[PDB]
């Protein structure tokens, strides 16, 4: 009973970072050495567990969270970081076990003219709690007289669309991030 890591890492359409996907991985046998010895991922930094001993442990529940961010923003997918992704889209706790997989996907998510399919939350009243998502689309501050459901001057739409083009430099190129989160049902 292999764990379905092949339908988290192979999916054609990943989700946006504001509505990041989440998959329960449970009651299966997980092979993590085939992900370490893959030579495809730019980032496989692991926190709270070492990746070479990952194939021996047993976990209770395993979450696989998948989203697409910018290339200059994979440093914000880390415990205790600050940015516009870790504040408003996807916050990881400080006591975080499990780990983060990122690889370059300019081959898959870049369209000539602008791939405005992935959106990141830009404006939200407070910072996010860890492992919390905010899929609601409501207008920002209204420091003056209220927006009344209408955009414009001094009333801002929260969601900003990523623009991915194949001519962008490495840092504006889209990256596909998978965040494994561990604790027994999932063994090696």
């Amino acid at each position, epitope marked *: 009973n292999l764990c379905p890591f092949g339908e988290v890492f*192979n*999916a054609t*359409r990943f989700a946006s970072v504001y509505a990041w996907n989440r998959k329960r991985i449970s009651n299966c046998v997980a092979d993590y050495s085939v992900l370490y010895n893959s030579a495809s991922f730019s980032t496989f930094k692991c926190y709270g567990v070492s990746p070479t001993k990952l194939n021996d442990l047993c976990f209770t529940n395993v979450y696989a969270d998948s989203f697409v961010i910018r290339g200059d923003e994979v440093r914000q997918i880390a415990p205790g970081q600050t940015g516009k992704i870790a504040d408003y889209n996807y916050k990881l706790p400080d006591d975080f076990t499990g780990c983060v997989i990122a690889w370059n996907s300019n*081959n898959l998510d*870049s369209k*000539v003219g602008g*791939n405005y399919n992935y959106r990141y939350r830009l404006f939200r009243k407070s910072n996010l709690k860890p492992f919390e998502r905010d899929i609601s689309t409501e207008i920002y501050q209204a420091g003056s007289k209220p927006c009344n459901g209408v955009e414009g001057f001094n009333c801002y739409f929260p969601l900003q669309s990523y623009g991915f083009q*194949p001519t962008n430099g490495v840092g504006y190129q889209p990256y596909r991030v998978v965040v494994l989160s561990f604790e027994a049902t999932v063994c090696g």
Partner: antibody
Amino acid sequence: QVQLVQSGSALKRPGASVKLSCKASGYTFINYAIHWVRQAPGQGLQWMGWINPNTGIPTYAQGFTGRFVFSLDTSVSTAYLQLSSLKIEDTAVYYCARDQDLYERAFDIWGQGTMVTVS
Amino acid sequence: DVVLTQSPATLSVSPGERATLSCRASHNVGTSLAWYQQKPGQAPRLLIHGVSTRATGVPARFSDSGSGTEFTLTISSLQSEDLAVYYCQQYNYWPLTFGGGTKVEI
């Protein structure tokens, strides 16, 4: 008319190489990806892989690694395929296909197929 | 890979009755499954992209249904020009995987 025009047939010896072109006319070539599908005679369709026109990176399936190499020329708007080191069990029809969308990979416009007969 | 199984391998229906072509997927491919039509000798021809969208130039008798791991292609009234081998293709997961095909016969 939107089209994908392929080359003619082939008759090669085992160990030889054949160069199949797939020329795209009627649409902007860089905007849409090109997928290669192989169909053996009396057998189902079997995906080989794809190549990106605006990035140039080829991707291969599980079995079509090594001998099969994709390439393209952007200016004349065509895509190629190297069948290096032909073996006897490569007698098949080789299609090139066009992608409907970036995330809707349904092959809306196909080629005509090049019957690569090897013996 | 996502093994897509089509049952039956061939089906025989009279010219005018409903023909249902099942394509069962190994994993949940969502609603991302295309249906092709390879008439004998010609290139395959796309019929339905995902369960709503039909192609350009396709007759309106072809209808898709199902989502997840169970997909049926339903031809309403069979003509004499719809005798081909119908392949289902998932595109939810890389690599893109085809089915075995279903030889429709009168």
